[PDB]
Amino acid sequence: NRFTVAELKQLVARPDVVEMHDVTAQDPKLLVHLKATRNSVPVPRHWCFKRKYLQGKRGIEKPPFELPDFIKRTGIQEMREALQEKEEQKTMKSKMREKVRPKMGKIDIDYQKLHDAFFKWQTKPKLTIHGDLYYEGKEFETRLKKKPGDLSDELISLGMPVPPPWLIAMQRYGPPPSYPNLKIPGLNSPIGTNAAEFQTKTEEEEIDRTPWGELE
Amino acid sequence: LNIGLQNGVLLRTVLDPVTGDLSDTRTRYLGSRPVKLFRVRMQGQEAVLAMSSRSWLSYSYQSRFHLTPLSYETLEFASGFASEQCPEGIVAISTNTLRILALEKLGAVFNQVAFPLQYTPRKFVIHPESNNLIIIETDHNAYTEATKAQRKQQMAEEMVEAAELAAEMAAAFLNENLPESIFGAPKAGNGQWASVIRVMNPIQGNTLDLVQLEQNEAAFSVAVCRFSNTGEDWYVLVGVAKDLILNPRSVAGGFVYTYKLVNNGEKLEFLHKTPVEEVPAAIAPFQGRVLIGVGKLLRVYDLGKKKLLRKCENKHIANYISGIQTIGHRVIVSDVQESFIWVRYKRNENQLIIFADDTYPRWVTTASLLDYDTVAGADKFGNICVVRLPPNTNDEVDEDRGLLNGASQKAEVIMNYHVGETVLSLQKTTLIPGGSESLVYTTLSGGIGILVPFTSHEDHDFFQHVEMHLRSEHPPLCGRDHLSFRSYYFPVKNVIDGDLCEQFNSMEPNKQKNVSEELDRTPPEVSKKLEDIRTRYAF
Amino acid sequence: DATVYVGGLDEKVSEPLLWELFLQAGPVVNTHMPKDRVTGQHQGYGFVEFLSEEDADYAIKIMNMIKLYGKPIRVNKA
Amino acid sequence: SPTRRRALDHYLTLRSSGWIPDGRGRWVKDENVEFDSDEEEPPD
Amino acid sequence: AKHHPDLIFCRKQAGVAIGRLCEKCDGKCVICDSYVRPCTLVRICDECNYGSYQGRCVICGGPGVSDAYYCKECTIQEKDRDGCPKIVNLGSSKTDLFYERKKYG
Amino acid sequence: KYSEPLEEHGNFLITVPGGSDGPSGVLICSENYITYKNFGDQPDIRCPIPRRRNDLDDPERGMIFVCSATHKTKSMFFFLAQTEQGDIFKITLETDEDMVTEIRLKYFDTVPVAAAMCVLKTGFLFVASEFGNHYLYQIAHLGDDDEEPEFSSAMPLEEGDTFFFQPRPLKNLVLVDELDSLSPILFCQIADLANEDTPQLYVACGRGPRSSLRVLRHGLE
Amino acid sequence: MFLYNLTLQRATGISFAIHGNFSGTKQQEIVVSRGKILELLRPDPNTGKVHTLLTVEVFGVIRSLMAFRLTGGTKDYIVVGSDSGRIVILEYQPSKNMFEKIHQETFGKSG
Amino acid sequence: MTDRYTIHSQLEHLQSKYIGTGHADTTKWEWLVNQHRDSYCSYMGHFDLLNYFAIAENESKARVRFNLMEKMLQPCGPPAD
Amino acid sequence: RGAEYVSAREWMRICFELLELLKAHKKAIRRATVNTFGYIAKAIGPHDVLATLLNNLKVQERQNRVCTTVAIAIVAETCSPFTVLPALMNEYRVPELNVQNGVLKSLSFLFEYIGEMGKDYIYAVTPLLEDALMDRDLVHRQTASAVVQHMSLGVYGFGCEDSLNHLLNYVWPNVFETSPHVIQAVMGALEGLRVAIGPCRMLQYCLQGLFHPARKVRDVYWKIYNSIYIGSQDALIAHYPRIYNDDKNTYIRYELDYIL
Ligand SMILES: [Zn+2]
Ligand SMILES: [Zn+2]
Ligand SMILES: [Zn+2]
């Protein structure tokens, strides 16, 4: 009575989204239609996991919260650290005795500095665009994966004047099979004629970049 | 007390009746020559006429002061006039002439002149050299001229086939003509489309040329452009749908008609007609060639002698294309419901590549480019947005991943605003000489507004505080919330409603004084600041 | 072939650098470059899982191109 | 030289009209792109 | 209340009667039960001010001493538009308290 | 109280003035018909809507009324109802004692299609067109002379075919004032095409035949 | 990018019109709804020209409009139904030249 | 089980009150009929959507409103059972 | 009204005494006590008051801690939040559970109290809340959701939607929690976010799970949809996706597809 995954995948306009269990849906056509619509964010992945959300062994070793920089500029952390480091040395006698004879003007930061922290030095944090749902491993798997033809400064280790050393051999051994469309200079890319870079120069000359309606 | 100066500025100053102490002087700059003031009488009231390079009449309407310039040539001198032929008029001498003038309509912002058309105008373009207009008109349910004539002849045959005197009646039936603008237009049915191209002089209003199309061919787009390969020769491209049904939608096809503009823009000469497989809803000139969006396909067309010629068509736009804008080698495509798409055209690969888009569904009706990175748009639902492109984005994309079933780079929405009525036209322009630019929009209902950017924070804080006071002090008259009204579909962003703010002057004087206390200003100063921004952008 | 074994390295080399090293050839989907805990230093041999076969076949050739700190690097299938 | 820049721009324009430079000094019509039947070779 | 899941609002079509609050409930919001920022006046349906009940507390039912408001947040979310906010059942907590004190006292 | 099925779908209702003045019922306007109904013993009364004689329209299209207005004098009352094509008819009810017996229906004039009409007491008619300019007419004559045929629900009519009338220029109304409306601005372009320094606005608006290109300038005419 | 909105030309299309004795006197006015705007128009009997007396912007969608008289009443009230989820009853004040809200009764959600 | 049945009674209570809320077993047909009918009501309500539709089809607004009211009965075809 | 009749040391020790008034059974005593803390902080300054109140969060019993939390917000509001913010945010690093729940709780009250004025500190406390929403303790997540609800409604109309959308990315995976307190705090946060970032975003989140195969994901998703539908039924007309026609039923809304 129900579709297998192959018929469903051909019946979608877009077959990359279909999963094992979508055929078990009561209306699978509409489900895979909705999964392939623009700007919708997928169901959180742990719906099928037996372990509870965020209850995982890696989460045991999470470090303490760190303040932002504009707050550490106030010096609140050093003051309050010193304060609570004295207050573990006091006995119950001494604590209950300074509760009848208090000590004024102890931990005071001037108001202008605190105002400046909030009304001058505030910086917007790193934010995430819509659809970027958090999942449990996320902050460790945030390294990602940098493409051939784009190099890092450090990869300094080569120390070669600017083409790649390996290419002097890629033309020898051939274009790698894994990449069908890759283009590198000297093999199938201009160091024919080389007018590709001139196009970008001419266009970059053409543009005005003056944002409309900004503050003066 | 009204004063005029060599500079050209008019000073209207309070004068205390019992004491004689001038108070506040709100200067205005009008014209370029010395201004001369003459007292006249309008509506049984004592208005003032100040004449500079252009005349300017200051009067009070609905117990509210106005200053609007006469749309008429400069005058040396003037004075009041009353007689049987004209009860309230102006006698004015320009050099070597004398004339009598009557201002029939007062209190208005625009005067208009109207030039009749036959069907509903969809678009027009301006020929740059001639300054003419090329207008396409289209109607559903309609007969063209020729189909109407054949239909009428068939009916006159039918009057004879019914029954010897009858042909006399049918003669009168062929003869009499009811004027269609006052008796209606005959309605034809579903799928019946009358359409017309018209070339028109904007000053005089006469039809320079007229092209009538076939009975189910409906014009939807127009362009005037010079194809760079063929040389300096203007061509007009008109996109036409063939046999279009609306509910449910179906179309038999499309054509693009090419005309040349001869005789300095007087005439269209038919060149060829090239068939496309879906309705060409947007045509845009693009670096010596043209971009045509046929349905969901974006294609570049080069002029060939037998037809237009196709190069590098794109096929990844989600739905129907409804409008195309260009700057440089960037193309901004307005999907019918998928909002804006940014596409880059790279020459030496000959391909069109989607590099960015938007994160919201938007039913776009129009668009206009504010700068190289910003697009303003409007919906059918009645709201304007301003979408910017984030500073890191590069259009160097070479053709899998994508974010959220779309492009890998997303554009940021930086303004939302619900106008209230469907906007069909945005244009960035300057309205007055020596003004600043603004974004002008015209709604379907007949309204015209502007969206003007603040130049300082101090202005922006003042106007935001005036708005927040008035939302509570002077709430909308039908029980609606203002912040909720302007956030009808998307939350309001970065706009101060000035229609609400200029209702300051309609509040009660205790309320005006109470509000103006917290702005630390007197109610004349608040009215002056509300009136300064309107003055230096607009009318 | 999806994975390769890589010998003969210097501990200043890093897994993130290694990923950028072999993605110069083709992207390393899964990187493994042991960190030894006891003395806190690397022996210098690597295992690489790719998208499919494509990354693996190139792998051996990618070894010749590689040269870390004036020294070569072993790459073979696994 | 400016003339060399202009020649390169002309080469770009030939790259846009659908011409492929696979011929070393010659050009080949691409099948994908619609061309008029009359023209046999790209203009210089 | 928001603290008692078994309590139930009247939710009939509200009328011109103004709802009131007893000394214990003075200054709080009828829906979300907050103490701050009062935005709009509460209207109760006809049946709920019938007869002797005219002027009792909306939230608990005691002698009312001041007018009840919705807070700003319930106004913005339009929680003020759902109906008569009179609580129509005592619930388990009120009943249990009575029997407990009566057992003791 | 009362619930009665209709024969075809109406689209709006007209309050018949009642109490001391006229009978109390409702006029139901439906496609190709106008029907008087009341609760009680009164039988329903139906009058077909007159069509234009020798009309160029598609024959399948029906005809409805788009707006109405009531003129109540102390003497008598009539309704002015406009059809889709712009034809305004007078509607008058004939009462035989307590109930009404027929509806009488007379071609009054042709005016642009309206969203609302308002018979002011001082013999004016205010037509607010649904698009384009609005008009204020003065009522010269009510339609009671000039030998013009008057259709009726009592006039016995054969199965398929209907009444016909012949439209004409204005007879009952004189145009007194016209109010400019830009609705609907379909397209706009702000440009300087007339070489005076300020730009003008070139706008395209209006529906069908009444559409126009307007040039708007800033200032008094 | 902070923008300020201004209206140069108000809407001119007409959705509703009701006629009544709104001013409270012999003269008859019309109250037109221009969708988002409520206007009061008084047409001159001898001259024949229509004059706009009042124009107020209501910030809502006016969806229905009626005129209302109490029994033995001279002045008429304007009853506006809108998308606000409430029903408003308005009275024109000629000495002040402004509409005056007399009643506002809330029954539902907005939109 | 009982929690399933209490969810079920609560959601049918909602659906009677606000027409057009769903539950876990809303079919496609039901959801789309609701959003068709809500669309029609919205079109009737806003004056300029209704202007736009009355211009794009060459119809008068009264005809447009009357056709939309006719479509409210079966907006998406017959029920799919 | 009369603070100059006593020395500052007297107000400090009387301030200390007020912490025993929070164990009262009658609620009116407790809310009069909390108010008095704000009045005193206007005389001896927020830091002396605030250190005392922050020390009181280590207590075990919840009635003491909830009231101390309200008093921290009271002073924070009356002596503007830049004064008491740094110390309160610093106290989140103390390795005790009740203190961390306590700071979160008083931020919740704070954003409720300051209202529109809270657009000035949303960027400050966004990283604190995203640290709390990633936390293993469920309570840490329910109090952070309460903070999001109240902060969301304050900045409505002010263009702070990027922070709020960022926080939605953290709030949203908690929809599959089953505990009722946490489950109603999450729903309150989403209802606050609907009025601040709009119905369109909230529908874009629900869309994929309304017809999901499991009833578990489905009914939770359907009861978010109903909340969006009730609150904003009219705005959703523009935001529904396009469903294609099947064999016998038509599903395209053809009117919107009209082109002028
Ligand atoms: Zn009470
Ligand atoms: Zn509340
Ligand atoms: Zn009740």
Swiss-Prot record, chain A:
It is found in: Nucleus; Nucleus speckle. Methylation at Arg-51 by PRMT9 is required for the interaction with SMN1. Changing residue 52 to R: Moderately diminished formation of omega-N monomethylarginine but greatly reduced formation of symmetrical dimethylarginine. Abolishes formation of omega-N monomethylarginine and formation of symmetrical dimethylarginine. The modification Symmetric dimethylarginine is found at residue 51. There is a cross-link at residues 35, 86 (Glycyl lysine isopeptide (Lys-Gly) (interchain with G-Cter in SUMO2)). The modification Omega-N-methylarginine is found at residues 51, 58. Changing residue 45 to K: Does not affect methylation by PRMT9. Signal peptide: none annotated. Residues 1-93 are annotated as: Required for interaction with PRMT9. Changing residue 50 to A: Moderately diminished formation of omega-N monomethylarginine but greatly reduced formation of symmetrical dimethylarginine. It is linked to Craniofacial microsomia 1: A form of craniofacial microsomia, a disorder characterized by a spectrum of craniofacial malformations ranging from isolated microtia with or without aural atresia to underdevelopment of the mandible, maxilla, orbit, facial soft tissue, and/or facial nerve. CFM1 is an autosomal dominant form characterized by mandibular hypoplasia, microtia, facial and preauricular skin tags, epibulbar dermoids, and lateral oral clefts. Affected individuals also present skeletal and cardiac abnormalities. This is Splicing factor 3B subunit 2.
From Swiss-Prot, chain D:
Residues 23-32 have a biased composition (Basic and acidic residues). It is found in: Nucleus, Nucleoplasm; Nucleus speckle. Residues 6-44 are annotated as: Required for interaction with LUC7L2. It is linked to Orofaciodigital syndrome 19: A form of orofaciodigital syndrome, a group of heterogeneous disorders characterized by malformations of the oral cavity, face and digits, and associated phenotypic abnormalities that lead to the delineation of various subtypes. OFD19 is an autosomal recessive form characterized by tongue nodules, dental and digital anomalies, narrow high-arched or cleft palate, and retrognathia. Some patients have notching of the upper or lower lip. The modification Phosphoserine is found at residues 1, 37. Residues 33-44 have a biased composition (Acidic residues). This is Sodium channel modifier 1. Residues 18-44 are annotated as: Disordered. As a component of the minor spliceosome, involved in the splicing of U12-type introns in pre-mRNAs. Plays a role in the regulation of primary cilia length and Hedgehog signaling. Component of the minor spliceosome, which splices U12-type introns. Within this complex, interacts with RNF113A, as well as with SF3B1/SF3b155, SF3B2/SF3b145, SF3B3/SF3b130 and CDC5L. May interact with LUC7L2 and SNRNP70. Coiled coil: none annotated. The chain holds residues 183 to 226 of 230 of the full protein.
Swiss-Prot record, chain G:
Coiled coil: none annotated. Component of the 17S U2 SnRNP complex of the spliceosome, a large ribonucleoprotein complex that removes introns from transcribed pre-mRNAs. The 17S U2 SnRNP complex (1) directly participates in early spliceosome assembly and (2) mediates recognition of the intron branch site during pre-mRNA splicing by promoting the selection of the pre-mRNA branch-site adenosine, the nucleophile for the first step of splicing. The core of the protein consists of three beta-propeller domains. It comes from the Eukaryota. It is found in: Nucleus. This is Splicing factor 3B subunit 3. Component of the 17S U2 SnRNP complex, a ribonucleoprotein complex that contains small nuclear RNA (snRNA) U2 and a number of specific proteins. Part of the SF3B subcomplex of the 17S U2 SnRNP complex. SF3B associates with the splicing subcomplex SF3A and a 12S RNA unit to form the U2 small nuclear ribonucleoproteins complex (U2 snRNP). Within the SF3B subcomplex, interacts directly with SF3B1 (via HEAT domain), SF3B5 and PHF5A. Identified in the spliceosome A complex; remains associated with the spliceosome throughout the splicing process. Component of the spliceosome B complex.
Curated annotation (Swiss-Prot), chain I:
Residues 112-113 are annotated as: Interaction with PHF5A. Belongs to the SF3B1 family. Phosphorylated. Phosphorylation occurs concomitantly with the splicing catalytic steps. The chain holds residues 1045 to 1304 of 1304 of the full protein. The record marks 5, 97 as: Interaction with RNA. This is Splicing factor 3B subunit 1. HEAT repeats lie at residues 8-46, 78-116, 119-157. It comes from Homo sapiens. Component of the 17S U2 SnRNP complex of the spliceosome, a large ribonucleoprotein complex that removes introns from transcribed pre-mRNAs. The 17S U2 SnRNP complex (1) directly participates in early spliceosome assembly and (2) mediates recognition of the intron branch site during pre-mRNA splicing by promoting the selection of the pre-mRNA branch-site adenosine, the nucleophile for the first step of splicing. The record marks 161 as: Interaction with SF3B3. It is found in: Nucleus; Nucleus speckle. Residues 204-260 are annotated as: Interaction with SF3B3 and SF3B5. Component of the 17S U2 SnRNP complex, a ribonucleoprotein complex that contains small nuclear RNA (snRNA) U2 and a number of specific proteins. Part of the SF3B subcomplex of the 17S U2 SnRNP complex. SF3B associates with the splicing subcomplex SF3A and a 12S RNA unit to form the U2 small nuclear ribonucleoproteins complex (U2 snRNP). Within the SF3B complex, interacts directly (via HEAT domain) with SF3B3, SF3B5, SF3B6 and (via HEAT domain) with PHF5A. The SF3B subcomplex interacts with U2AF2. Identified in the spliceosome C complex.
